[PDB]
Design a protein around this ligand. Sequence first.
Ligand SMILES: OC[C@H]1O[C@@](CO)(O[C@H]2O[C@H](CO)[C@@H](O)[C@H](O)[C@H]2O)[C@@H](O)[C@@H]1O
Ligand SMILES: *[C@@H]1O[C@H](CO)[C@@H](O)[C@H](O)[C@H]1NC(C)=O
Ligand SMILES: *[C@@H]1O[C@H](CO)[C@@H](O)[C@H](O)[C@H]1NC(C)=O
Lengths: 124, 108
Amino acid sequence: FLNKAFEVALKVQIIAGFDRGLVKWLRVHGRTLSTVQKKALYFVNRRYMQTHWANYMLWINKKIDALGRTPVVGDYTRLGAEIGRRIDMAYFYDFLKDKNMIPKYLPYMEEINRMRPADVPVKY
Amino acid sequence: AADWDVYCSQDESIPAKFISRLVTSQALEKTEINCSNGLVPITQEFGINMMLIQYTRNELLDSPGMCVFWGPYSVPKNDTVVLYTVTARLKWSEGPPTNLSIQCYMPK
Ligand SMILES: OC[C@H]1O[C@@](CO)(O[C@H]2O[C@H](CO)[C@@H](O)[C@H](O)[C@H]2O)[C@@H](O)[C@@H]1O
Ligand SMILES: *[C@@H]1O[C@H](CO)[C@@H](O)[C@H](O)[C@H]1NC(C)=O
Ligand SMILES: *[C@@H]1O[C@H](CO)[C@@H](O)[C@H](O)[C@H]1NC(C)=O
């Protein structure tokens, strides 16, 4: 559906924005977390984008339609950065740490963490 | 072929956490959450998936995929909790869809 350049532009910004927030949260709350628990939360960020891609596209398509002009890759960069910022992922980080529910770090998570954000698979 | 939970908060200002795990070989074509502010689609990937569910429509912002509980509802048994709820419909490649109830009781 969406041109590959536009998909990549979105994904790079969404993951960048989620990762920024996690780094900030870890500076305060990461001391007692293990390395694999930290990697699990990085995976949470990538998987959150995958899980919500369908409703991201609904919101993006409305915004793009509102441009009243043919879109360019910068339009998707911008919207991807808005998606990455307009959520407080600490509701998850705090909940998962406080309730001792950070997921067991499994190989399918490591596989996603090792991907370039541009290559993280999403479904339409 | 799917497992799920909801983790309810003690205050309307903190959203609930919905967590699902998808274990499948018939594939899952659609997942739609029926929220008080509309129908929200999600894509449940292999393994763990997560979503926030807001208790009040006053927590909505111009952002994708926000979901507000229906409610609050009084319940017949007692007057010390109210009920918040959404439902989910899972459309499978074969056979009838799975319908899920996601409920949170809030102390009063
Ligand atoms: O009917 C939903 C429809 O509304 C849009 C924008 O008008 O999104 C808003 O409503 C959704 C509820 O279904 C929320 O999930 C979302 O956060 C909110 O922006 C569309 O994205 C959607 O198709
Ligand atoms: C959501 O579910 C309610 C019943 O709980 C139903 O009345 C309504 O039609 C559903 N919404 C959509 C958009 O299907
Ligand atoms: C009140 O009713 C709700 C729903 O039926 C139940 O979850 C809760 O435990 C009840 N509280 C008491 C004190 O019985």
